[PDB]
């Protein structure tokens, strides 16, 4: 559920997230991919992002990672960027599955990758 | 604004007759010149009844210009404006540029100086040539050459039909196209490109017909082109001057070559089907199977697109249909260009040939753009060259025509930095 | 009071047609006709925008500046197009290139003298001049460059009369041009240092406000323009009407600009209800402040809710109680104490005309000076750098006789302008 | 005061059409027309359910919440359907799946904000708000889930104004759905902890009461609905009329809820006689109490005779003797001392309006708070466990972002709710 | 909401033409597309005066789709929406799924992505296939396959015509049906099932005719189906969305397969006889000789039924006729299920072919349900498979078509846990 996913995400990323809608920003999605791939330009991602224009950049970054990797999964930015609960819930659920299968043994330091942002 | 036009090479002339046809067709000016400013930026109101063209025609064999002065339209141009050199064409740059082509140039220029004077504060010359030809590659090379000096203070948008990716014709083609590129590069403002083969696909896949006569491809460019000058130089809700292009379209001095694309290509006989949405056509623009160029966005990041719309279009529809796109990221990401979308809105919908094979919608999108994609197209065309040069192949045909190991080798190095250029301006952040 | 409108560029021009389309009807002036005015009050103050010659021909006292014939030749060949005295048309048949530099240093700089000429013929018209209205877009040549020059000259000729500027700052989501931030950053620069009242409108803030606040499904430009022109009528012309408590450009200026930058506002109209249905008439007044003060409904792109206000000017125009007006404004100032800045006990500047918009019962123009507009010049300024860094389409500027230090200048300036504005949000 | 109805889901919606079908006539409001009121009294208090805009258009102040277009598009395309201002229609064209979870966490949760928005536009209407009326069925998505959310939000926004809830608890004998106890147990949970007055109706308690107490042979839904809507009119609207001894939602609330759970009642109408024949007029009064207090005639499923009462509210509305009313109530309280709980000397709350149901001479709504309703939540709660145990159609919930502890929660809660209620039956 | 539909396989197409017929027939839209939202969840108003189809047609032999574009209705669909692979059908899964069927899929999808876009917030795709075929089993297998990923967020109700219990046709049938089940299982939402043979009985016993052309069985499903989408997506006194189904109809993720049943099947010529009571039709629903499936409730405990009624029906009549049933016990419902009766009430009565052989009553009951009964039907169909696989029979026909000992053996094990599944979810308390 939302509760379960949020708990998982917060522990993994060391995030505060109160609600699923927060994922709409796209930062977390990029970082989840970073934990798996470690290829993402984290400095570029607007972790803190207040404004929509910033969200778009995160989405572009996310899209690029999918393309680089050859990840088939669809990403409908228009839906997600709205920060609507259902769309984000669904995307997050898929991401978790992706992480479970893909994530390697190597440890990941979310804070450091962010630059402690 | 006006904009003169110089259709060079049989092809540039066939395409010319075509683009020139579509014109009167949507301006109510029968082949007799008479109709019963606005569009004055392409037609001079000579005498008190007629509409003498506003361009010229240059071919070294009479055959092709001859046919123009047979078939209705015969009445359209001035007996004068159709230049010919009874001599020989020769599918070789050298001869057409240097040796033969030279003799005519003066005379040629004279018209683009005689036709350039008669007008009122012009904007430039829409040049029409066929990259891989003799009269088209060579000649122009020095025509555009002699222009960049006589009117550096204007626009030089050359509309080319560069070498089919696998279906070329001439055996030498590349020799002629690596040479028209290097000589014109330092002279053009914006070079539009329409791939002959990649247009066939459109005739097979987006119109269905394995019977595409050259006379068709011409009707097509004859369309995409109408969207450039014709209608644009024509009032609208979001006018776009010729200068506008090069400005909003070229990021760098290399006479950068965008690609032409049209949206509604659907065959008559389909003519009744419910029309396509503002969103669909917009989207069709981001499909690598509808762009008059075998440069499928295989990676080439767009860097500026000039979406010229025409017909019934609500600015919000656009300033939304484009928004949706800006967030697809089909292109992939270069940092440097935030927004590269020049929205050009015209009023009058397109105008399809009475009974060719073009659908006839009430709105279209002739989007052209610079895409890091051509990094390919140039590559694949450069490589060609080497293979032959590597053995001198038909070299003796040029040398013996006032050229040297220089011009080739030194025009090869030229494009080399066009493969690096189109690489650096992209792929990197 | 008087004033003399200025239609710089195409946009600023296109809008001219709408600003005058309106205003005239709000003054009973038919194409070339005279004052058919349903009333007698829409005449005692017209002067502010016209001139007496014939006796039925009160001609709009504006200027039409543009380097693209076709444009003014569309505005002059259509509806009200035949009311401007030809002398008003200061065209530049040159190549109206989309370059700020091409309409400010090379091409426009020539056509300027032949403009100032008229801007003086109109200023020295009669009575006493107040200021000039300026319409244009900061995303093109004839707009940002040449129009931004027209003012730099105006403000040297009469540093006394005011200068309201109506700018169509480059909409976010999708820009209607490519160099946009170039033509923009360069014009805002000129603005922050000449005009002293700027009303920034966003083609997409309008769409929104025009497609959801007016179920309007096909918002043509004419519309957007029309909506805008609706606000600029409430501002000026309006206050040049009677009122229990009337103000005028200056009051508006002398109550809205705490610090000399000039500061830019964000206009908002009152009754903005869809035609048939919506015609709820919920316009007692709490309904107008309800409107005006919400996020959406601010012609600007940014949302007030994203930054305090320094000043506000509800310029109402329709019979109402100086009590239910003066009162409402208060609760509003207390329900949102959060964002309304404190070092100004009464941010709001209540203004109250009498006669309302011709066919309406009660309206109220909103002119907000919020710190929120910080988050727009930011935008613009960003776009610049991201492309300046690579000198993107810079050759079209320099090649026109420009400077690599000119662009630096503007960005910084306008960039600092962002800074300052925050100095109050805190 | 005032109140603002809420048509959650299809059912709650379908009923809206009947509750408003009635109420209007009980207030002389034609489709879009105004007050044709046979009298002048059906107007001095209307406000409770409408709003003044035009002068002939008093629009019902309710909300229409639903994730299935077709529905509201049947209510809006039929009879009185064209009286609601479109703003009222808060649709969710999404897939209105029959999942409590799909209309409370995933699909409905989105459409919520666009609802609360209006529930505030209506609340901040004018005068003083009393509470909100809520109609829906606890056996579906848009009903139990999304409507049960609408309140959890309402009760956070105005924990002052009251919340009457009209729930169509899952009828026994046959369930018009399959997961029913899932969508139900989950909504009752939300109810026992937000609304503070719930009137539970049973589609089959109605049939019965509608096929034997009204020889009616073909009781279409419209009917059932109609009967129900008849009771909710006697409750609210009614008391917002004069009376020798009038009450209002609160009185009703402050006299009927001994313990904060919120407790659910069981409404019963008075003159419930078949058309022609039966028109016995035996309505002196002992005939109404005869009615109201019998087993059958309780819109609930359970039978009072199966458990004491805590409170009762005979809200009569038709000229009668405060003596033959106050009196009857007594004998009734003594003939059945057995079931009527003792620690409340006077369980009954006699209420007395004046004007009766438009065409009738004397009626009396009954709102019983009997401990009998224990034997219903039991039912529901049973059905749950019997199927929860095997997680029957649980994947349709979880797969929608739910929790295995969520279902546990509700059942228990609502299950405990059964417990408590017995604490008084003893 | 709408619900697209993909009729795959000659059969799924014949049945399609049928179900598609009944449609316009009860919506006043002549074969010309024109009638003189409501039902928009199955028809797009291409403008304009027409209606068109909100579905597609996929067969690898032209024969069958060809006939559609001959016989009135020819005008109904868009020339486009009827996909074909001139190539070969092949009554073998493998070839249709892998090898051949593959080539077309893209194109196929494209329409269900092009038709899925044009609409407004859809609900899913009603798929029509014939379990034991080549184009019907295989192909779809990957069609539904590619859907579950491209629109996991929707409904996937596939309407199948699974293998006649003794009167099969293809020699391999089971190979093709044990394979369409395992590949689609993890992709469908609710799979409706209509047994070809068990429908004949209805034509022999409940209508009398030993002359049942395929064109009839089609009229029948063509009926039961009309009760699903058509009328349901159509306003009523107790609407039932598509989602509704799967929710109120599947207790577990296995793309569970309920059975379709209709109440009033009585032959014209009987057409005058006094109509049947609400009680009779209701009761007819619990008779194992009227259910379009040879899965006679030999023990299979129902676990959820969606009684879709249409016509003049009083909710009490139902909320009574059903009550009577709930207490017949010999109709034993699952344990873990208190109440499993989704009462769906529509208004408009059924609509019988002008002159086929269907009675034409003023009320009907299209009840579908999940019954532990199929424990049989699957069993009996699985066993089949083994017998042949046990000898590899026509195995070389698939292997040589891009399959392996894997896909068979590993799809057998698949269904195995479908014989245990349909066993565990019932028979036990
Ligand atoms: N679209 C289009 N392409 C054409 C047409 N005619 C020729 N071409 C292409 O242009 C090239 C042919 O150039 P040529 O006709 O050989 O030569 P030319 O450029 O006219 O000049 P010369 O070599 O001196 O005769 C080939 O690549 C053709 O495919 C035409 O009418 N339309
Ligand atoms: N009800 C019904 N069943 C049909 C119809 N046509 C075929 N069937 C049944 O469906 C199965 C036949 O499938 P085929 O026609 O052989 O094949 P297909 O599924 O169309 O695809 P392919 O094998 O590649 O040709 C048999 O079990 C038939 O009894 C029809 O029109 N109606
Ligand atoms: N609101 C509004 N915005 C307009 C209008 N015309 C143009 N714009 C906006 O103004 C900007 C460009 O304005 P434009 O009118 O092209 O300037 P110009 O100077 O006349 O252009 P040029 O002649 O150099 S190409 C874009 O951001 C566009 O969205 C109009 O009529 N109304
Ligand atoms: N009294 C009454 N009961 C109704 C009515 N409509 C539905 N019901 C009852 O309500 C329950 C289901 O209500 P329904 O209207 O389907 O909810 P919904 O949320 O709108 O359903 P969905 O959209 O998730 S499928 C069933 O128990 C049914 O008997 C109505 O108009 N009147």
Residue A111 burial by CB count (10 A; 0-12/13-18/19+): exposed, middle or buried? Answer: exposed
B276 and B349 in one domain?
A: yes
A91: closest CA among A104, A108, A79? Answer: A79
- For residue E150, which residues of chain A lie inside 8 Å, CB to CB? 74
* Nearest Cβ partner for D402 among A1, A85, A86: A1
Residue found by looking up tokens 């109109």 in the block? C122
Q: Is the CB of residue E381 less than 8 Å from the CB of residue E295?
A: no
B222 and B131 in one domain?
A: yes
D56 φ/ψ angles, rounded to the nearest 5 degrees: -145, -5
Q: Does the CB of A78 have a partner CB in chain B at under 8 Å?
A: yes
- A80 Ramachandran zone, left/alpha/beta (phi>0; psi -120 to 50): alpha
Reduce the DSSP state of residue C225 to 3 states and report it. helix
CB atoms under 10 Å from CB of B332, counted, come to: 18
- Pocket-forming residues, ligand 4, beta carbon under 6 Å: D 9-11, 14-15, 68, 96, 98, 137, 139-143, 168, 170, 176-177, 203, 221, 224-225; E 241, 244
> H-type helices in B233-346, by residue range?
242-249, 278-284, 315-326
CB atoms under 10 Å from CB of A70, counted, come to: 6
- What would be the CATH architecture of the domain defined by D1-258? 3-Layer(aba) Sandwich (3.40)
- The secondary structure of C346-359 as a DSSP string is T-EEEEEESS-STT
C-alpha A87/C-alpha E112 separation (Å) is: 22
B312 and B163 in one domain?
A: no
Q: What residues have CB less than 8 Å from D326, skipping those under 6 apart?
A: D350
Q: Is the CB of residue B314 less than 8 Å from the CB of residue C220?
A: yes
Nearest ligand by distance to the CA of C228: 3
Q: Give percent helix, percent strand, percent coil of chain D, each to the nearest 5.
A: 45, 15, 40
C-alpha C316/C-alpha C288 separation (Å) is: 9
E335 and E194 in one domain?
A: no
C-alpha D161/C-alpha D133 separation (Å) is: 11
Q: What residues have CB less than 8 Å from D127, skipping those under 6 apart?
A: D2, D47
C-alpha C298/C-alpha D249 separation (Å) is: 42
Nearest ligand by distance to the CA of C179: 3
Superfamily of domain C373-426: Helix hairpin bin (1.10.287.600)
Q: Could you tell me how far CA B55 lies from the centroid of its own chain?
A: 15
C-alpha C374/C-alpha C169 separation (Å) is: 13
Strand C62-66 to C264-268 pairing: unpaired
Read off the tokens for C362: 């009660």
Q: What residues have CB less than 8 Å from A24, skipping those under 6 apart?
A: A55, A80, A81, A82, A83, A84, A88
Reduce the DSSP state of residue E149 to 3 states and report it. helix
Q: Which of B299, B328, B334 has the highest number of chain A CBs within 10 A, making it the mutation to test binding with A? A: B328
Read off the tokens for E341: 């009766």
The experimental technique behind this entry is: cryo-EM
Residue found by looking up tokens 């109805």 in the block? D5
Contact E150 A90 (CB under 8 A): no
C-alpha A47/C-alpha A53 separation (Å) is: 13
E34 and E13 in one domain?
A: yes
The beta strands (E) that lie in chain A are given as: none
B327 and B205 in one domain?
A: no
E28 and E177 in one domain?
A: yes
- For chain E, the maximum distance between any two Cα atoms, rounded to a whole number of angstroms, is 60
Q: Give percent helix, percent strand, percent coil of chain E, each to the nearest 5.
A: 40, 15, 45
Give me the numbers of helices (H) and strands (E) for chain B, helices first please: 15, 10
Q: Does the CB of E268 have a partner CB in chain D at under 8 Å?
A: no
Residue found by looking up tokens 């059906």 in the block? D42
Q: Which of E231, E258, E285 is the last residue of a domain?
A: E258
- E172 Ramachandran zone, left/alpha/beta (phi>0; psi -120 to 50): alpha
Q: Is the CB of residue C134 less than 8 Å from the CB of residue C165?
A: yes
Distances A34 to A46, A59, E357 between C-alpha atoms, Å? 14, 14, 65
Residue found by looking up tokens 């029959």 in the block? D98
The topology (CATH level 3) of C259-372 is 60s Ribosomal Protein L30; Chain: A; (3.30.1330)
C-alpha D14/C-alpha D270 separation (Å) is: 24
C-alpha D333/C-alpha D330 separation (Å) is: 5
- The secondary structure of C71-130 as a DSSP string is HHHHHSSSSGGGSS-GGGEEE--S---S-TTIIIIISHHHHHHHHHHHHHHHHTSSS---
| Beta-bridge mates of residue D425 | none
Contact C178 B336 (CB under 8 A): no
Crossing angle of helices E405-419 and E375-389, in 10° steps, is 150
Buried b / exposed e over C30-42, threshold 16 CB at 10 Å, is eeeeebebeeeeb
C-alpha D179/C-alpha D105 separation (Å) is: 17
C-alpha B361/C-alpha B271 separation (Å) is: 8
B239 and B103 in one domain?
A: yes
User: Among E103, E133, E135, E199, which residue has the most ligand 2 atoms within 8 Å of its CB, making it the best to mutate?
Assistant: E133
Torsion of CA E220, E222, E228, E231, to 10 degrees: -110
Q: Does the CB of B327 have a partner CB in chain A at under 8 Å?
A: yes
Residue D58 burial by CB count (10 A; 0-12/13-18/19+): exposed, middle or buried? Answer: buried
C349: closest CA among C214, C218, C239? Answer: C239
Reduce the DSSP state of residue A105 to 3 states and report it. coil
C-alpha E127/C-alpha E242 separation (Å) is: 13
The beta strands (E) that lie in C205-336 are given as: 264-268, 309-317
Torsion of CA C269, C275, C278, C283, to 10 degrees: 40
Q: What is the CATH number of the domain that holds E334?
A: 3.30.1330.20
Q: Which of E234, E258, E282 is the last residue of a domain?
A: E258
Distance (angstroms) between ligand 1 centre and the Cα of B159 equals 13
Q: Which of E358, E373, E388 is the last residue of a domain?
A: E373
Q: Nearest-5° angle of CA C312, CA C317, CA C318?
A: 135
Reduce the DSSP state of residue D133 to 3 states and report it. strand
Read off the tokens for B262: 């049209």
Q: What residues have CB less than 8 Å from B143, skipping those under 6 apart?
A: B6, B8, B58, B105, B108, B109, B112, B127
- DSSP state for residue E243 in the 8-state scheme: H
B130 and B177 in one domain?
A: yes
E327 and E249 in one domain?
A: no
Strand C348-353 to D62-66 pairing: unpaired
HEC letters along B96-111: HHCHHHHHHHHHHHHH
Strand D5-8 to C364-370 pairing: unpaired
Q: Is the CB of residue C375 less than 8 Å from the CB of residue A51?
A: yes
B242 and B218 in one domain?
A: yes
| Beta-bridge mates of residue D132 | D163
Distances E408 to B405, D286, D333, E396, E418 between C-alpha atoms, Å? 67, 79, 77, 12, 15
Q: Which chain B residue's Cα is nearest to E78?
A: B273
C-alpha B274/C-alpha C273 separation (Å) is: 34
Residue E359 burial by CB count (10 A; 0-12/13-18/19+): exposed, middle or buried? Answer: buried
Q: Where in chain C is the domain with CATH 3.30.1330.20?
A: 259-372
Q: What residues have CB less than 8 Å from B410, skipping those under 6 apart?
A: none
Q: Could you tell me how far CA C103 lies from the centroid of its own chain?
A: 20
Distance (angstroms) between ligand 3 centre and the Cα of C141 equals 9
C-alpha B223/C-alpha B229 separation (Å) is: 11
Read off the tokens for C421: 């504005």
HEC letters along E293-348: CCCCCCCCCEEEEEEEEEECCCHHHHHHHHHHHHCCCCCCECCCCCCCEEEEECCC
CB atoms under 10 Å from CB of C294, counted, come to: 14
C-alpha E282/C-alpha E322 separation (Å) is: 7
- DSSP state for residue B155 in the 8-state scheme: B
Residue found by looking up tokens 């200056």 in the block? C250
Residue found by looking up tokens 């005006």 in the block? C292
C-alpha E138/C-alpha E161 separation (Å) is: 14
C-alpha C67/C-alpha C108 separation (Å) is: 7
Buried b / exposed e over C388-409, threshold 16 CB at 10 Å, is bebebbbbbbeebebeeebbee
Q: Is the CB of residue B121 less than 8 Å from the CB of residue B153?
A: no
C-alpha E219/C-alpha E108 separation (Å) is: 26
- This structure's resolution (angstroms)? 8.6
D310: closest CA among D372, D376, D355, D227? Answer: D372
Q: Is the CB of residue D173 less than 8 Å from the CB of residue D130?
A: no
**Which residue owns the Cα nearest ligand 1 atom 22?**
B134
Q: What domain range is E159 assigned to?
A: 1-258
Long-range pairs of E416-419 with CB within 8 A, sequence gap ≥ 24:
E416/E382, E418/E181, E418/E185, E418/E254, E418/E378, E419/E375, E419/E378, E419/E379, E419/E382
- The secondary structure of C362-383 as a DSSP string is --EEEEEEEGGGHHHHHHHHHH
| Beta-bridge mates of residue C264 | C198
Distance (angstroms) between ligand 4 centre and the Cα of B189 equals 69
Strand C131-136 to C5-8 pairing: parallel
Reduce the DSSP state of residue B175 to 3 states and report it. helix
Read off the tokens for D191: 């109810």
Tally of domains in chain E: 3
Read off the tokens for B422: 């189109």
Contact D74 E235 (CB under 8 A): yes
Q: What is the CATH number of the domain that holds E104?
A: 3.40.50.1440
Q: In what order do the strands lie in the sheet with B82-84?
A: B82-84, B55-59, B3-8, B124-129, B157-160, B190-193, B259-261, B363-371, B302-311, B341-345
Distance (angstroms) between ligand 1 centre and the Cα of D79 equals 71
Q: Where in chain C is the domain with CATH 1.10.287.600?
A: 373-426
C-alpha C270/C-alpha C367 separation (Å) is: 11
Q: What residues have CB less than 8 Å from C263, skipping those under 6 apart?
A: C198, C256, C257, C310, C369, C421
Read off the tokens for B46: 């000579």
A60: closest CA among B326, B371, B425? Answer: B326
- For chain D, the maximum distance between any two Cα atoms, rounded to a whole number of angstroms, is 61
Handedness of CA E38, E42, E47, E48 (dihedral sign): negative
> H-type helices in C94-248, by residue range?
108-123, 146-157, 181-191, 203-211, 221-239
B203 and B113 in one domain?
A: yes
Q: Is the CB of residue B214 less than 8 Å from the CB of residue B251?
A: no
E250 φ/ψ angles, rounded to the nearest 5 degrees: -115, 125
Long-range pairs of E41-49 with CB within 8 A, sequence gap ≥ 24:
E41/E2, E41/E3, E41/E122, E41/E123, E41/E229, E41/E233, E42/E2, E42/E3, E42/E5, E42/E229, E42/E230, E42/E233, E44/E118, E44/E119, E46/B273, E46/B274, E47/B274, E48/B274
């Amino acid at each position: 559920s939302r509760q379960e996913l949020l708990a998982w995400i917060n522990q993994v990323t060391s995030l505060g997230l109160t609600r699923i809608e927060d994922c709409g920003k796209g930062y977390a999605m990029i970082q989840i991919f970073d934990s798996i791939y470690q290829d993402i330009p984290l400095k570029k991602v607007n972790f803190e992002c207040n404004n929509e224009y910033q969200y778009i950049n995160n989405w572009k970054v996310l899209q690029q990672v999918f393309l680089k990797k050859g990840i088939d999964k669809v990403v409908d930015p228009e839906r997600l960027s709205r920060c609507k609960m259902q769309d984000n819930l669904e995307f997050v659920q898929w991401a978790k599955r992706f992480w479970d299968q893909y994530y390697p043994g190597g440890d990941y330091d979310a804070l450091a990758r962010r630059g402690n942002r | 604004r006006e904009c003169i036009s110089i259709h060079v090479g049989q092809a540039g002339v066939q395409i010319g007759n075509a683009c020139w046809e579509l014109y009167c067709l949507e301006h109510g000016i029968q082949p007799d010149g008479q109709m019963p400013d606005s569009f004055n930026t392409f037609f001079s109101e000579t005498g008190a009844g007629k509409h003498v063209p506003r361009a010229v025609f240059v071919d070294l064999e009479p055959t092709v210009i001859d046919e123009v002065r047979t078939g209705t339209y015969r009445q359209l141009f001035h007996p004068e404006q159709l230049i010919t050199g009874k001599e020989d064409a020769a599918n070789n740059y050298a001869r057409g540029h240097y040796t033969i082509g030279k003799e005519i140039i003066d005379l040629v220029l004279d018209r683009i100086r005689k036709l350039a004077d008669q007008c009122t504060g012009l904007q430039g010359f829409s040049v029409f040539h066929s990259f891989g030809g003799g009269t088209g590659s060579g000649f122009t090379s020095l025509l555009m050459e002699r222009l960049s000096v006589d009117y550096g203070k204007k626009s030089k948008l050359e509309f080319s039909i560069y070498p089919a990716p696998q279906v070329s014709t001439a055996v030498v083609e590349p020799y002629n196209s690596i040479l028209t590129t290097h000589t014109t590069l330092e002279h053009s403002d914006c070079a539009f490109m329409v791939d002959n083969e990649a247009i066939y696909d459109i005739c097979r896949r987006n119109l269905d017909i394995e019977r595409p006569t050259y006379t068709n491809l011409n009707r097509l460019i004859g369309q995409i082109v109408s969207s450039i000058t014709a209608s644009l130089r024509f009032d609208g809700a979001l006018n776009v001057d010729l200068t506008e292009f090069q400005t909003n379209l070229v990021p760098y001095p290399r006479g950068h070559f965008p690609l032409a694309t049209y949206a509604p290509v659907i065959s008559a006989e389909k003519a009744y089907h419910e029309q396509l949405s503002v969103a669909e056509i917009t989207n069709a623009c981001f499909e690598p199977a509808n762009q008059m160029v075998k440069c499928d966005p295989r990676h080439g990041k767009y860097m500026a697109c000039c979406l010229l719309y025409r017909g019934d279009v609500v600015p919000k529809d656009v300033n939304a249909a484009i928004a949706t796109i800006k967030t697809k990221r089909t292109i992939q990401f270069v940092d440097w260009c935030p927004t590269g979308f020049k929205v050009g809105i015209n009023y009058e919908p397109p105008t399809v040939v009475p009974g060719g094979d073009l659908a006839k919608v009430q709105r279209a999108v002739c989007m052209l753009s610079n895409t890091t994609a051509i990094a390919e197209a140039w590559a694949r065309l450069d490589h060609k060259f080497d293979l032959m040069y590597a053995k001198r192949a038909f070299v003796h045909w040029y040398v013996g025509e006032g050229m040297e190991e220089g011009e080739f080798s030194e025009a090869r190095e030229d494009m080399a930095a066009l493969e690096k250029d189109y690489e650096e301006v992209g792929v990197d952040s | 009071r008087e004033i003399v409108h200025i239609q710089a560029g195409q946009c600023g021009n296109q809008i001219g047609a709408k600003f005058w389309e309106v205003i005239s009807d709000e003054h009973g002036i038919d194409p070339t006709g005279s004052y058919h005015g349903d009333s007698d009050l829409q005449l005692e103050r017209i002067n502010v925008y016209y001139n007496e010659a014939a006796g039925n021909k009160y001609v709009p006292r504006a200027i039409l500046v543009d380097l693209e014939p076709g444009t003014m030749d569309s505005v002059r060949s259509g509806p009200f197009g035949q009311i401007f005295r030809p002398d008003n048309f200061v065209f530049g048949q040159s190549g109206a290139g989309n370059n700020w530099a091409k309409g400010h240093y090379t091409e426009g700089a020539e056509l300027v003298d032949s403009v100032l000429d008229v801007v003086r013929k109109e200023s020295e018209s009669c009575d006493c001049l107040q200021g000039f209205q300026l319409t244009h877009s900061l995303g093109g040549g004839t707009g940002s460059g040449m129009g931004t020059l027209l003012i730099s000259k105006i403000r040297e000729e009469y540093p006394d009369r005011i200068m309201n500027t109506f700018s169509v700052v480059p909409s976010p989501k999708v820009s209607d041009t490519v160099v946009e931030p170039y033509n923009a950053t360069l014009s805002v620069h000129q603005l922050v240092e000449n005009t002293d009242e700027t009303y920034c409108i966003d083609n997409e803030a309008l769409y929104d406000i025009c497609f959801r606040t007016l179920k309007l499904t096909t918002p043509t430009y004419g519309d957007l323009n029309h909506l805008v022109s609706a606000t600029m009528s409430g501002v000026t012309t309006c206050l040049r009407f009677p009122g229990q408590l009337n103000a005028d450009l200056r009051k508006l200026a002398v109550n809205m600009v705490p610090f000399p930058r000039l500061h830019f506002f964000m206009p908002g109209f009152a009754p903005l209800t869809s035609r048939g249905s919506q015609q709820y008439r919920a316009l007692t007044v709490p309904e107008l402040t309800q409107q005006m003060f919400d996020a959406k409904n601010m012609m600007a792109a940014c949302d007030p809710r994203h930054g305090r206000y320094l000043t506000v000017a509800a310029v109402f125009r329709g019979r109402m109680s100086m009590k239910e007006v003066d009162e409402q404004m208060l609760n509003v100032q207390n329900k949102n104490s959060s964002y309304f800045v404190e070092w100004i006990p009464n941010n709001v500047k209540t203004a109250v005309c009498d006669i309302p918009p011709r066919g309406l019962k009660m309206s109220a123009t909103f002119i907000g000076n919020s710190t929120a507009i910080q988050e727009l010049f930011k935008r613009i300024s960003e776009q610049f750098t991201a492309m300046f860094r690579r000198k993107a389409f810079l050759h079209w500027y320099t090649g026109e006789g420009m400077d690599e230090m000119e662009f630096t200048e503007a960005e910084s300036n306008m960039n600092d302008l962002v800074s300052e504005y925050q100095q109050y949000q805190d």
